[PDB]
């Protein structure tokens, strides 16, 4: 199940995203060749654990930019849903303005390609993938729904892969 | 692809391990039902990223014991190779005495079952799996060969799954 394999090219995708400026744009994983990419899935918009994760990554996007690394979040919700959540203030339980793009995967094909579809519910597990500047998958993380991810740990991994990339 | 699926029983195994007392014993994942298990693969013995991880999990095994959690390491090397590394003095790059068992997977079937065999080389990637006290797989972590895992992160995940098990 899925085509995400360590040491092999990460599965490409082309999807509509809500961009940091608040507007829609169709983006592809291949747009970010030359940069490391952290690509993470969350189950659903308008939930309780996912916003804490999304906001944590968005708040700390600058730490990833200094590592020449693009962060991209994704769920199976529509792109309109993403925009409604961004336009809901954080004070009121929304995401607020974002520093990272949020991809919409409404046909669930990206989640299936990455092997993180919870088939009996049509939603993704908490999958996170680290892809190097050549597009090669370097790291797979999948959490069951109840437990969120750590930005600290993700930064540690990105830094460590970049460090070992310099060896010869 | 393997048979390790979030929310499903983690694949059972029965394999020879070198135990903390330095003796060989055949153990099974099902021996630890009723406790959380952290089951991690490392690629080969007598290497220079794996020992940092193994020694860290061994050194801090009491923190997992406080969480009622058993840590188990594994590689495709023979159990004789495992013990030779344990018996190598730490000052010469050895593991030293271990607080955790080290499973031998010489047929590569356990790595295949867990979807972490690097097929063109016959060794495992750095897979780590968190399995709950009912035997259900809760978390999947797979790193490419160059980059090690974090005990802190593993403890964070084990504790968080146990907390959400009780309330949520
Ligand atoms: O000993 C090492 C060191 C890996 C490493 C350490 C630093 C680097 O910058 C880098 O590119 C690779 O890895 C081995 C795993 C391994 C086994 C076989 C290989 O052909 C391999 O490339 C790595 C281990 O720790 O078990």
UniProtKB/Swiss-Prot annotation, chains A, B:
The modification N6-succinyllysine is found at residue 33. The keyword Manganese does not apply. Phosphorylated on Thr-88 during the M-phase, which leads to a more than 80% decrease in enzymatic activity. Acetylation increases reducing activity and resistance to superoxidation. Deacetylated by HDAC6 which decreases reducing activity. GO terms for molecular function: cadherin binding; identical protein binding; peroxidase activity; RNA binding; thioredoxin peroxidase activity. Keywords: Acetylation, Antioxidant, Cytoplasm, Disulfide bond, Isopeptide bond, Oxidoreductase, Peroxidase, Phosphoprotein, Redox-active center, Ubl conjugation. GO terms for biological process: canonical NF-kappaB signal transduction; cell population proliferation; cell redox homeostasis; erythrocyte homeostasis; fibroblast proliferation; hydrogen peroxide catabolic process; leukocyte activation; natural killer cell activation. It catalyses: a hydroperoxide + [thioredoxin]-dithiol = an alcohol + [thioredoxin]-disulfide + H2O. It comes from the Eukaryota. Its EC number is 1.11.1.24. The modification N6-acetyllysine is found at residues 5, 14, 25, 33, 134. The modification Phosphoserine is found at residue 30. The keyword Oxidoreductase applies. Residues 4-163 form the Thioredoxin domain. Induction: Constitutively expressed in most human cells; is induced to higher levels upon serum stimulation in untransformed and transformed cells. The modification Phosphothreonine is found at residue 88. Belongs to the peroxiredoxin family. AhpC/Prx1 subfamily. Thiol-specific peroxidase that catalyzes the reduction of hydrogen peroxide and organic hydroperoxides to water and alcohols, respectively. Plays a role in cell protection against oxidative stress by detoxifying peroxides and as sensor of hydrogen peroxide-mediated signaling events. Might participate in the signaling cascades of growth factors and tumor necrosis factor-alpha by regulating the intracellular concentrations of H(2)O(2). Reduces an intramolecular disulfide bond in GDPD5 that gates the ability to GDPD5 to drive postmitotic motor neuron differentiation. The active site is a conserved redox-active cysteine residue, the peroxidatic cysteine (C(P)), which makes the nucleophilic attack on the peroxide substrate. The peroxide oxidizes the C(P)-SH to cysteine sulfenic acid (C(P)-SOH), which then reacts with another cysteine residue, the resolving cysteine (C(R)), to form a disulfide bridge. The disulfide is subsequently reduced by an appropriate electron donor to complete the catalytic cycle. In this typical 2-Cys peroxiredoxin, C(R) is provided by the other dimeric subunit to form an intersubunit disulfide. Homodimer; disulfide-linked, upon oxidation. 5 homodimers assemble to form a ring-like decamer. Interacts with GDPD5; forms a mixed-disulfide with GDPD5. Interacts with SESN1 and SESN2. Interacts with FAM107A. This is Peroxiredoxin-1. It comes from Homo sapiens.
């Amino acid at each position: 199940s899925g085509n995400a394999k360590i040491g092999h090219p990460a599965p490409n995708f082309k999807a509509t995203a809500v961009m940091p400026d608040g507007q829609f744009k169709d983006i592809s994983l291949s747009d970010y060749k030359g940069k490391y990419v952290v690509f993470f899935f969350y189950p659903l918009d308008f939930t309780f654990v996912s916003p804490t994760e999304i906001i944590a990554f968005s708040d700390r996007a600058e730490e990833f930019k200094k590592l020449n690394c693009q962060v991209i979040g994704a769920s199976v919700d529509s792109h309109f849903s993403h925009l409604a959540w961004v336009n809901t203030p954080k004070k009121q339980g929304g995401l607020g303005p974002m520093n990272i793009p949020l991809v919409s995967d409404p046909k669930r094909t990206i989640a299936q390609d990455y092997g993180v579809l919870k088939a009996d519910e049509g939603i993704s597990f908490r999958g996170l993938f680290i892809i190097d500047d050549k597009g090669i998958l370097r790291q797979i993380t999948v959490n069951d729904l109840p437990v969120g991810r750590s930005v600290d740990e993700t930064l540690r991994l990105v830094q460590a892969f970049q460090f070992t990339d310099k060896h010869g």
